[PDB]
């Protein structure tokens, strides 16, 4: 239906900003390799790599909805 | 109802993305930091809560939506 | 009904997520001209240019869905 249309825009919007989420993440980590190890990032590498595999699981759940 | 499942997966969706992006805010203000006082990101900080904000309550209506 | 006003909150969360994501991209931007030319973004921003560009493309149908 057109609720169904709207919904599906609405999770290309997400999917098309994870991906600029994730753009914005990879441009911070050049910027902190640039004064060297990322030692000290570890833990914030840690959740977003879980909030992102959370994002991932509930973009698929999204769409393997009915099917 | 089916709809009903999926736009609750969509919130979900935000709220994790919402987490993301907050990461993302706090690693952008440690790398500031970086270089001295954030005096000259104090307008960047006002926008970045009020917009933080605005979500918070949206995603407040849209879980209180019936109830 | 219920399942529009539902769906007209989520779109404004992502919009205000929007707002949000470009504000983290400005302020890595700032960061990165602190070492010079952003030469070297230029693919970088070339993407983000493209995925907001997408972004806008599906908010504004997600608006004018019905009219």
Known sequence: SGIV????????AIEAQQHLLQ????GIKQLQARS?????????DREINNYTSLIHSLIE???NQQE
């Open 36 to 44: 060297g190890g990322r030692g000290g990032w570890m833990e914030w």
């Open 23 to 26: 753009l914005t993440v990879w």
């Open 5 to 12: 249309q709207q919904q599906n825009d609405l999770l290309r």
């Open 61 to 63: 759940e999204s769409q």
